[PDB]
Design a protein. Sequence first.
Lengths: 132, 50
Amino acid sequence: EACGYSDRVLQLTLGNSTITTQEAANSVVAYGRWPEYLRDSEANPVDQPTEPDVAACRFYTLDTVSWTKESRGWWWKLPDALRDMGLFGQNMYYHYLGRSGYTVHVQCNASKFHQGALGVFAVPEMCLAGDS
Amino acid sequence: TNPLVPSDTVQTRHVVQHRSRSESSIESFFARGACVTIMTVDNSASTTNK
């Protein structure tokens, strides 16, 4: 844009939280589907749902990990990784049922003299293999 | 029997119900062959005591 808007420079705001980035590579919407609330025609439990809205739909930052030459990779599961995150976690443990979409923002800056490439994958039903 | 539905005693949401009772119609409940007997016959020579 001639007003300066860039594919690389984004701002995301959810609830009381804002993320800025100046070196993005656009952003992905998985399978082209934006998150949505459950529609009446697809509904199943009949009780009134709770929708905590801004109290749970906000950015939670997890513990920072460290990338080195010996790193083989990292994994997390959702909603598990957020089970202890504020009122989202509370709502999760108080109810039998729950559904949620997510904005995932992975952060890793370095310098024009560093190099490396992280593949960041969101996998539906990411069943992992056991040690046995 | 008290004809209640969930919205009578709790807060409910709107749900568009798609389920049906098609398989529990009297016809559907009985629409199966069931074994009622086993008959035994043979093809042996008839002889004076059998």
